[PDB]
């Protein structure tokens, strides 16, 4: 294991001040330009729009264009220019640091897995929510596909078992994963019709492809809002905050390009322009950066270190999502 922040120190401890509870929704395939807040022609985030204190960041570039490339980069200390996907597994990452310093680290995954991020930590700290042995919310649709909102159930059991510790909870969304966008959301989110239902995209009508994708965003809107609502039930004992960032974007037909994962060298902008949201309880004193700060996946690591009052030399000068 190649270390990167052995000098990390936590300025204050949860037995000397209020313990901190953060949820980090790791998004999937959401495009910045299909977010109402960024100027999209459709109200794709009605529920988030109603919550005090959500900052929308209009200029975020992902590190890569695929789940395997981007997710380790989001948690890496190296930044996008030095980051090596092929050695990421055995670098210290920001969660390794936070767990070393005693932050209780949980990763629930309704997508695939942590793509190497959690491999150094005990397996009990990772849970698979794609299956019904963990996810109680699977029979809400004719595919029995387990829903992201199932990762919220029982989080109060985790909080009880870590009572009075700092806690970072990662929720890795199914989100807008394709090509079967039509499967990603329940009926109550089927707001735009008709929708595409085939695996051969391009063969679909373009408006119907857009509709299915947009419907899936509506379910992600509901998921992020319920995440914040779950956090708000602990706001008095805990300093609660919520960070959402998508791992990459998605091509939706432009110039004949669909899905994602094109190499950075010639990948279109739709594949790297990702939404990011930050909410915090005003009681925590955290100040977000300007809504239009120029931001990339490099800001995630320093954001998480700052949310837990930890400083590290390697990201000392790095812009974060918070001041
Ligand atoms: Au992805």
Swiss-Prot record:
- Positions where Phosphothreonine occurs in the chain: 67
Q: What is the effect of changing residue 115 to A?
A: Abolishes transfer of phosphoethanolamine (PEA) to a lipid A analog in vitro. Almost abolishes resistance of E.coli strains Rosetta or TOP10 to colistin and polymyxin B, by comparison with the same strain expressing wild-type mcr-1
Keyword Phosphoprotein tagged: yes
Per the record, what ranges lie on the membrane's Periplasmic side?
1-323
Q: Where in the cell is it found?
A: Cell inner membrane
The keyword Cell membrane is annotated on this UniProt entry: yes
Disulfide bonding pattern of the chain:
63-73, 138-146, 196-204
Q: Which UniProt keywords apply?
A: Antibiotic resistance, Cell inner membrane, Cell membrane, Disulfide bond, Membrane, Metal-binding, Phosphoprotein, Plasmid, Transferase, Transmembrane, Transmembrane helix, Zinc
Query: Tell me, what is an example of a GO biological process annotation in this record?
Result: response to antibiotic
| PTM section of the record | Phosphorylated at Thr-67; may represent an intermediate in the catalytic mechanism.
Effect of substituting residue 250 to A: Reduces resistance of E.coli strain TOP10 to colistin, by comparison with the same strain expressing wild-type mcr-1
Activity regulation reads: EDTA may inhibit activity. May be inhibited by ethanolamine.
Q: Mutating residue 177 to A: what's the consequence?
A: Abolishes transfer of phosphoethanolamine (PEA) to a lipid A analog in vitro. Almost abolishes resistance of E.coli strains Rosetta or TOP10 to colistin and polymyxin B, by comparison with the same strain expressing wild-type mcr-1
Amino acids binding Zn(2+): 28, 67, 247-248
Tell me the membrane topology, using the record's own terms: Multi-pass membrane protein
GO CC annotations on file: plasma membrane
The Swiss-Prot or TrEMBL record describes its family as follows: Belongs to the phosphoethanolamine transferase family.
Miscellaneous information on this protein = This is the first (November 2015) reported plasmid-mediated resistance to polymyxin antibiotics; although it does not confer a high MIC it protects against colistin treatment in a mouse infection model. Colistin is one of the last-resort antibiotics available for multidrug-resistant Gram-negative bacteria such as K.pneumoniae, P.aeruginosa and Acinetobacter. First identified from a pig farm in Shanghai, China in July 2013, retrospective screening detects the gene in (slowly) increasing proportions between 2011 and 2015 from pigs and chickens, and also in hospitalized patients in China.
Q: What is this protein called?
A: Phosphatidylethanolamine transferase Mcr-1
Q: Which residues of the full protein are shown?
A: 219 to 541 of 541
